[PDB]
Design a protein around this ligand. Structure first.
Ligand SMILES: NC(=O)C1=CN([C@@H]2O[C@H](COP(=O)(O)OP(=O)(O)OC[C@H]3O[C@@H](n4cnc5c(N)ncnc54)[C@H](OP(=O)(O)O)[C@@H]3O)[C@@H](O)[C@H]2O)C=CC1
Ligand SMILES: NC(=O)C1=CN([C@@H]2O[C@H](COP(=O)(O)OP(=O)(O)OC[C@H]3O[C@@H](n4cnc5c(N)ncnc54)[C@H](OP(=O)(O)O)[C@@H]3O)[C@@H](O)[C@H]2O)C=CC1
Ligand SMILES: C#CCN(Cc1ccc2[nH]c(N)nc(=O)c2c1)c1ccc(C(=O)N[C@H](CCC(=O)O)C(=O)O)cc1
Ligand SMILES: C#CCN(Cc1ccc2[nH]c(N)nc(=O)c2c1)c1ccc(C(=O)N[C@H](CCC(=O)O)C(=O)O)cc1
Ligand SMILES: Nc1nc(=O)c2nc(CNc3ccc(C(=O)N[C@@H](CCC(=O)O)C(=O)O)cc3)cnc2[nH]1
Ligand SMILES: Nc1nc(=O)c2nc(CNc3ccc(C(=O)N[C@@H](CCC(=O)O)C(=O)O)cc3)cnc2[nH]1
Ligand SMILES: O=c1ccn([C@H]2C[C@H](O)[C@@H](COP(=O)(O)O)O2)c(=O)[nH]1
Ligand SMILES: O=c1ccn([C@H]2C[C@H](O)[C@@H](COP(=O)(O)O)O2)c(=O)[nH]1
Lengths: 519, 519
């Protein structure tokens, strides 16, 4: 045999790869990738062959690629016996015989030309596809990468990387077809002895064997199942937690009338250095998120201000009937109480109403946090809490994102840890992830650092039963690279941030998915 | 070919397997295991053969095992043509030819007899060893399982299970010898395309690719490296976190004079249904742990009481010079301040000295916790906190185990979640794990539930540089099954627990490892 892989970089939405004989963007890392991958070979005494259309050959500047051999497909171009590292062929099929000999040629790469790509696929000449997904879709394109035939399936999807604020992925598709079902769990299949034993041990003991209490998700509820050992994109941190409760979540009632399926004690990780964790498998209402955040930062608890800026997430838990219902009927229409923010800027403060001027009262954690963060970074007490046993009863809703800790890496990056007691994976989480990601970025700009990593530890991770068809729909969408989020100016004080100060570069999510909140 | 596996159950320390022709214990699950494993076959038309010494044959009661074929090795016993499911052989070697034919015989199992075991190993007839480790070592034994030859290596170690309070494991050794180094990471080796790509991608980007910031532990610092895909025992949750910081921990200074190597945002899981998470790779001072816990429960803050019961963990952070040093020189010799416990039983209480009678002051979280736990189990607010922004300055030490949440499973089990801001993996963690495990058990007995699961989320997980050789020593020890911890009586009130009320059944740890605390 002999392998044939495609290497291409196309826009995330329309698979745009070229414009007037040029790449529609310039990302050196991707060129470096192309170089690394197409040079990568086992036999020092062999070379790899890169097949390309004549037009691409013109794009390269008709000059050979080091250590490799360029194979140009063209009807006109002369079979120049001159350069040995370059050879011409009249049709794609003929060139492919690199297999049929030139044992000097270890591997084959179809390097480009919408035409050459399309033909390679049509004649089923390719085994693999190395696809760099570039996140910029509103620019001119005149060349495209054909749709990947169904005989191909994704086996790996890298995390998102940034270059000049352009987001991008790296994922490889393999043309697998053989073999039946297969187990989605990547731990199995390593050696039958283990698999068999654990299975047997699982029959003897039942729910007694903890493993049986944490069953790996079934294919039908596992996002992009084919990527079994390469679920690198951090959106799988969420998608999997989703299918993980969908698999083990215990059906249970709660204070609202809508029951949920839940599991206890979970975690998700998110990089923030190369991208912003704004879920792509569903359009997320980032503005509302933001406006809720500064609201907290300000120490505001007047739910009208959010409504005024057309942000209604706190309407439900803020209505007259809800307050009445929870023994706060004395409270004004939207005075949510000593909730987040009040506890952030006025911890332990004696709350009256959302109208009083609490300036000076309580403990300003946010202030101290920022101060400690920049004056004693290696400090191990960079903590922010909203769980006040004394204030709970006055809150419209007990703090869900209970406590967060901050860490300053040796290389001056700011990471964040958040412990959430209760998490609505359907509505909450998406917001929650973005929110604390932003807060970290703000804290970072203000303290002179850059975003590091975001880790969230969940207590009661649940899915409201009325979100089942919706989240199933969402789990059917393959993740796209995360976008980038940047501040347009350096604020002096953390509370000066405004919506206009934010830039969401390259966000191309799937259509929004409607889901109803449980009051 | 044809496989030959040993199936045996021996005591954890001396490999005791028999006493006066009887098993020195009775665990039905293990017999059920033996049955499952020795019956487990691919070809419906074949049977498995179980080889055993005559004495064991007498132990079985000289009656065949269903669906299988018993092969008795004996010099005297008649070659009875009678029972077809039982056949006799004069020597071990001869019997092994089950391979050499009887294609009706799919697999071979060496089922016992210290003598038969010893010979099977000595003549290198066995491929695998299924070893059930039983945790009871102070009983008479007259038969033993020989030491496993070095050609054998452990590839799997189950979680710990209980039966009549006896703890036990299930681990399988495979006689692997071939192949060089091999990567410890179980994610690699699944398919070169992925591995290669990630490696290359890792060269292009550096610390930029998050993965490179979370490098998998190197073999030399990985506990029992051979178990690559079977690290089921939950003590690996700790051992690995250990080697994980040892691999990526950033060297950094802190308030004490001893620097540490740390990583941010980690987690560990522990089952509590079938065993008690008391590390075995090092003898752990469980009594001190306990005495510190009720101390907290009581709401006590007088560090003398611990010293009085010969518990000195809080001496350091309690001395006159330490208090002076942290601006609490006005405080009495061991009045630690509104620390854990005071915040547990008197949250937000106005602290004076360890002598005042705080009865009635503050918020009794522990009390409410217990009440909420039993009156509204599915409740999602079962929280306990020690992080009081207002009290911090009066504490000898800021709360390390910051906040914990509790969950009551549908099957009435009580699980626990703990967020720890700072964790000394060398000294703290071991204590920390046991401590919160016990607290959960107590809360459970008192609320009418049984222990579920314990999950710990770490913020600054670090290793003090002066614990390096010690933890290296510890990482060289292969885990033994966790013990069992039971209460000898049902207390009426949670604070009535006494050391005498506890039973640590089957704890056989490795020798204690001395490590010094950083003040
Ligand atoms: N984003 C990415 O990863 C990549 C992007 N690109 C972009 O794509 C564009 C170039 O591709 P595209 O316009 O399709 O041109 P291609 O590079 O495929 O080249 C087309 C030429 O190849 C020869 N050819 C193609 N098919 C045949 C055939 N069946 N028989 C004989 N000769 C054949 C012809 O040359 P002749 O006329 O001389 O006979 C044809 O004009 C550029 O904009 C380039 O930047 C290119 C590679 C990768
Ligand atoms: N914990 C566990 O997993 C297990 C525990 N056990 C325990 O071990 C004890 C039994 O084992 P142990 O005392 O060694 O006895 P074994 O079961 O090995 O049986 C010994 C007998 O096997 C025959 N035999 C052994 N070697 C040879 C040989 N080289 N050539 C010919 N015949 C041979 C002899 O019988 P003959 O005299 O008739 O010639 C010998 O007396 C019991 O207490 C039993 O409960 C047993 C299996 C498993
Ligand atoms: C987390 C958090 C903060 N919060 C506050 C908040 C208050 C009470 C709660 N109650 C329950 N049961 N679950 C929650 O997630 C929840 C969240 C949120 C509340 C609603 C939505 C929501 O419906 N979001 C959009 C719809 C509105 C929009 O488009 O802006 C969505 O459907 O995704 C998001 C966040
Ligand atoms: C966690 C926690 C509570 N604590 C309180 C406490 C207070 C200050 C701290 N300071 C630092 N830097 N690290 C700590 O782990 C730490 C822990 C502990 C303190 C010491 C030991 C300790 O030395 N344990 C034994 C020795 C004593 C014994 O045998 O009883 C050991 O060496 O394992 C354990 C727990
Ligand atoms: N993922 C991907 N990215 C690409 O840029 C790419 N480019 C083409 C075609 N042509 C281009 C043109 C020039 C170079 C080039 O100069 N490559 C050199 C230098 C790379 C570097 O180190 O920057 C090489 O060594 O391959 C690469 C691709 C086809 N498939 C691709 N596929
Ligand atoms: N791990 C292990 N446990 C054992 O008990 C064991 N026992 C022997 C030898 N003999 C004994 C004697 C009787 C039975 C027995 O009756 N087995 C039946 C019933 C098992 C059940 O369902 O309880 C079988 O089906 O194998 C098992 C082992 C050898 N290796 C072992 N190895
Ligand atoms: O940042 C947030 C704000 C609150 N909620 C949701 C989680 C729960 O669905 C609900 C609180 O439920 P109870 O704890 O009151 O039962 O609020 C979130 O998920 N994240
Ligand atoms: O239950 C406990 C008691 C405290 N410590 C340790 C962790 C840190 O090593 C030290 C506090 O360090 P700083 O946060 O003060 O830097 O106390 C624990 O690990 N666990």
């Amino acid at each position: 045999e002999k392998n044939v892989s495609i290497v291409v970089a196309a826009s995330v939405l329309s698979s745009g790869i070229g414009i007037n004989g040029q790449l529609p963007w310039s990302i050196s890392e991707d060129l470096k990738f192309f170089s690394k991958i197409t040079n990568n070979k086992c036999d020092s005494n062999k070379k790899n062959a890169l097949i390309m259309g004549r037009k691409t050959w013109d794009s390269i500047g008709r000059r050979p690629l080091k250590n490799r051999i360029i194979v140009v497909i063209s009807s006109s171009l002369p079979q120049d016996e001159a350069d040995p590292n370059v050879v011409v062929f009249r049709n794609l099929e003929d060139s492919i015989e690199n297999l049929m000999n030139d044992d000097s040629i270890e591997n084959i790469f179809v390097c480009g030309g919408e035409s050459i790509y399309r033909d390679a696929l049509k004649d089923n000449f390719v085994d693999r596809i190395y696809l760099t997904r570039v996140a910029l879709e509103d620019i001119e394109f005149d060349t495209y990468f054909p749709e990947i035939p169904e005989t191909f399936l994704p086996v790996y999807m890298s995390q998102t990387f940034c270059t000049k604020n352009i987001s991008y992925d790296f994922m490889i598709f393999e043309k697998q077809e053989k073999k039946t079902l297969q187990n989605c769990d990547p731990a199995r299949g390593q050696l039958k002895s283990i698999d068999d034993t654990v299975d047997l041990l699982g029959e003897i003991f039942g729910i007694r064997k903890m493993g049986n209490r944490h069953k790996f998700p079934k294919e039908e509820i596992y996002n992009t199942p084919s990527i079994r050992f390469g679920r690198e994109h951090y959106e799988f941190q969420y998608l999997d937690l989703l299918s993980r409760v969908l698999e083990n979540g215990a059906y249970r009632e709660n204070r609202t009338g809508i029951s949920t399926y839940s599991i206890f004690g979970q975690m998700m990780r998110f990089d923030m250095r190369e991208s912003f964790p704004l879920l792509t498998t569903k359009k997320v209402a980032i503005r509302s998120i933001f406006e809720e955040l500064i609201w907290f930062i300000k120490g505001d608890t007047n739910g009208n201000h959010l409504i005024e800026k057309k942000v209604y997430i706190w309407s439900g838990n803020g209505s007259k009937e809800y307050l009445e219902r929870i023994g706060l009927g004395h409270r004004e229409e939207n005075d949510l109480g000593p909730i987040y923010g009040f506890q952030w800027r006025h911890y332990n403060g004696e709350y009256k109403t959302m109208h009083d001027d609490y300036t000076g009262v309580g403990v300003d954690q946010l202030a101290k946090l920022i101060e400690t963060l920049k004056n004693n970074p290696k400090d191990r007490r960079h903590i922010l809490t909203a769980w006040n046993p004394s204030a709970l009863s006055q809150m419209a809703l007990p703090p869900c994102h209970v406590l967060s800790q901050y860490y300053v890496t040796n290389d001056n990056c700011l990471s964040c840890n958040l412990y959430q007691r209760s998490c609505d994976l359907g509505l909450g989480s998406p917001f929650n992830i973005a929110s604390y990601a932003i807060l970290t970025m703000m804290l970072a700009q203000v303290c002179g650092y850059e975003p590091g990593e975001l880790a969230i530890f969940i207590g009661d991770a649940h899915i409201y039963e009325n979100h089942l068809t919706q989240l199933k729909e969402q789990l059917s969408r393959t993740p796209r690279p995360f976008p980038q989020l940047k501040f347009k100016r350096k604020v002096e004080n953390i509370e000066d941030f405004k919506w206009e100060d934010i830039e969401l570069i390259g966000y191309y999510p799937y259509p929004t998915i409607k889901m109803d909140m449980a009051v």
